[PDB]
């Protein structure tokens, strides 16, 4: 009756502490899940942005390639032009000798 | 003994409830970690993607600079071509007057 | 009463085991949060990389558009230059026939 009720006093006080710890734990878990859900939200955003960026890069890469082809064709024509202009200047110099 | 038995009955009931809470809490934790691990997997994919994209942007940026530099040369050459043509046109107009 | 003693010892053991389970649960929670906080740190790094990449893409996109514009203009100028040259060659042919 003195040790048994000592024992029950210990049991009930431990149970009450455990109840508190369970309450604190539930809160920790809630607070954790807020962080986790915020992370999932942020990840979803980033995933969408990466997708868009990957698409915009692909497009940019295609266009660069396109512009590169065009540039080569341009450089080609310009070399022809400069060569033709040189022929012309020499034609003119020959004509000026005959007048 | 009757009072102690009543106390034991309440104790056992509380302990039963605590055990259920704890089982519930464990489930919560493991479900939380399913999400956390999927988050981590998704971050990993995104990081790889961000890395590919960063490289691809670097390449595109270099190609753009190179095209921009070629373009500047081309524009100078067109300047030169146009002045040569203008000179030629003058020379031609003069020659036409002499013949 | 010897049963009562068995039962209290039973109870004390179960409470001991519950306390250990609580301690284990807390550890799980803090370990979970280490993963969560690392995820948060990694998401932040990725957000910053994405924001930079988005800007750089925009810059590149603008520059491609500007180069494309420039090249379209050069192509127009070449079209005209080539016309000026056909005409010049015609004139020169005419001059050659008159001298
Ligand atoms: Cl780009
Ligand atoms: Cl997370």
Swiss-Prot record, chains A, B, C:
UniProt note: phenotype after gene disruption: In vitro, loss of sadA does not affect cell aggregation, biofilm formation and adhesion to epithelial cells. Disruption does not affect the course of infection.
Official protein name in the record: Autotransporter adhesin SadA
More info: Immunization of mice with folded, full-length, purified SadA elicits an IgG response which provides limited protection against bacterial challenge.
Description of its domains: The signal peptide, cleaved at the inner membrane, guides the autotransporter protein to the periplasmic space. Then, insertion of the C-terminal translocator domain in the outer membrane forms a hydrophilic pore for the translocation of the passenger domain to the bacterial cell surface. The surface exposed region contains four YadA-like head domains and extended stalk regions, multiply segmented by FGG, HANS, DALL and neck motifs.
Organism: Salmonella typhimurium (strain LT2 / SGSC1412 / ATCC 700720)
Entry function: Involved in cell aggregation, biofilm formation, and adhesion to human intestinal epithelial cells.
Family to which this protein belongs: Belongs to the autotransporter-2 (AT-2) (TC 1.B.40) family.
Subcellular location: Cell surface; Cell outer membrane
Subunit structure: Homotrimer.
